[PDB]
Amino acid sequence: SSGLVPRGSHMQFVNKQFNYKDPVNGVDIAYIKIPQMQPVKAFKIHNKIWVIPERDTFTNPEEGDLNPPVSYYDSTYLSTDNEKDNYLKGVTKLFERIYSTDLGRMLLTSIVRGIPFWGGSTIDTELKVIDTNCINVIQPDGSYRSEELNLVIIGPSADIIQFECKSFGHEVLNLTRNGYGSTQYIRFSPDFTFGFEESLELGAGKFATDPAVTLAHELIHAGHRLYGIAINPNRVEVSFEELRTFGGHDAKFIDSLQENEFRLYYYNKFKDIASTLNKAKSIVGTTASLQYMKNVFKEKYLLSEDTSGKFSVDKLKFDKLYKMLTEIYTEDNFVKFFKVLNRKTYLNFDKAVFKINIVPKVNYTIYDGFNLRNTNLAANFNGQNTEINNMNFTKLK
Numbered sequence: 001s002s003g004l005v006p007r008g009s010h011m012q013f014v015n016k017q018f019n020y021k022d023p024v025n026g027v028d029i030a031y032i033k034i035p036q037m038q039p040v041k042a043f044k045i046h047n048k049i050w051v052i053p054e055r056d057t058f059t060n061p062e063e064g065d066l067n068p069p070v071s072y073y074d075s076t077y078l079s080t081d082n083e084k085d086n087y088l089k090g091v092t093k094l095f096e097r098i099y100s101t102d103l104g105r106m107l108l109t110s111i112v113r114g115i116p117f118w119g120g121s122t123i124d125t126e127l128k129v130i131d132t133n134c135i136n137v138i139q140p141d142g143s144y145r146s147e148e149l150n151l152v153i154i155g156p157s158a159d160i161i162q163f164e165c166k167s168f169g170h171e172v173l174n175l176t177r178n179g180y181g182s183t184q185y186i187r188f189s190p191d192f193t194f195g196f197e198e199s200l201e202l203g204a205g206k207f208a209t210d211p212a213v214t215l216a217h218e219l220i221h222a223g224h225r226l227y228g229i230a231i232n233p234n235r236v237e238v239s240f241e242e243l244r245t246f247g248g249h250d251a252k253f254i255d256s257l258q259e260n261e262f263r264l265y266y267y268n269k270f271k272d273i274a275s276t277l278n279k280a281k282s283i284v285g286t287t288a289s290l291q292y293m294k295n296v297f298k299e300k301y302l303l304s305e306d307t308s309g310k311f312s313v314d315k316l317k318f319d320k321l322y323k324m325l326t327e328i329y330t331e332d333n334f335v336k337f338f339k340v341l342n343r344k345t346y347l348n349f350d351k352a353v354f355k356i357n358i359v360p361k362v363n364y365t366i367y368d369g370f371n372l373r374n375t376n377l378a379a380n381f382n383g384q385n386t387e388i389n390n391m392n393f394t395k396l397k
């Protein structure tokens with residue numbers, strides 16, 4: 001058993017209990033293409049969110065090969081259909097675990113509403129979608145259709161443990177730093193994890209990071225980049241972006257004056273988006289209504305509208321959204337909600353990498369994770385202890 005529905009009748013975020021064996025339908029199970037490649041079978045777990053149970057050899061023309069030149073390699077991983085089915089069920093299980101918390105519900109909600117801005121036109125009075133913010137969805141008859149999306153969960157590239165949140169860029173615009181946003185691609189695996197040492201209070205213990213926490217870390221990156229408020233990776237050796245995402249006392253090392261300069265910068269960035277929406281008179285993209293799309297982005301950025309239908313940015317409303325995305329949505333805050341053990345700083349991880357399997361509910365539950373209640377794994381985070389609960393963790397190098 002998987003234990004995907006601990007309470008209720010159906011899963012609360014993921015729309016279907018997908019099997020990889022399930023036939024394509026062109027709606028939530030289909031072969032897709034990322035804007036040369038071979039069509040891959042993907043699954044739509046939620047609105048604007050797709051899952052591709054394949055190793056990432058598509059997004060980067062320099063990483064189209066699973067060749068080994070903190071890391072781990074295995075070119076045989078995620079090659080059989082059984083693994084792809086286990087990957088798929090593992091990811092959906094982590095979403096439900098994340099969505100089982102108040103913080104996770106808010107984060108996922110913010111992500112879905114964070115539709116990438118329509119700013120692909122050269123006419124400043126014309127709204128146009130950006131091609132890289134879409135995927136081609138093959139139908140049963142064999143025809144394409146362009147579908148917009150916000151988030152894609154895909155398998156890791158050559159280096160398996162190296163999880164990251166990346167997206168396609170613009171030759172002129174910086175979609176992740178101008179407030180627009182772009183379709184985020186998260187390289188992730190629910191079949192692996194990394195370790196960290198912790199003196200619990202004998203000697204220090206060897207624990208493993210809850211994969212739910214790690215996925216949440218990447219989703220926070222996505223939230224930043226979907227609303228185009230991510231920090232430039234030049235700001236650092238650990239970047240400010242990673243330090244903000246981790247949260248806790250880590251993010252406090254960024255001086256408050258620097259924070260105010262950022263917050264005011266994106267406040268004006270959202271203002272430019274408001275002015276663009278006001279000058280929008282035409283729209284390219286057939287059926288898509290201009291009035292409907294203006295409302296979509298009014299909803300997204302929480303813009304005010306007067307009697308004459310003019311959009312504008314409310315000050316204390318922006319600060320609410322900004323604080324939510326940057327200060328409330330942190331890895332540290334998720335650790336508190338999950339009530340699990342985690343490293344106290346972003347870089348406080350060892351080189352240890354473990355093979356896991358969170359799908360069986362005898363191994364991992366939506367409510368508790370590894371630390372199963374009513375057992376000996378509920379005390380002192382024994383479920384995350386690689387020594388005690390060794391049956392759940394296989395040491396790798």
Ligand SMILES: O=C(C[C@]12C[C@H]3C[C@H](C[C@H](C3)C1)C2)NO
Binds near residue numbers: 162163165194221242
């Ligand atoms: O934060 C990262 C890098 C790392 C993600 C996971 C946690 C640590 C160790 C590994 C796996 C790389 C940082 N990506 O966005």
Ligand SMILES: [Zn+2]
Binds near residue numbers: 218221242
């Ligand atoms: Zn990160």
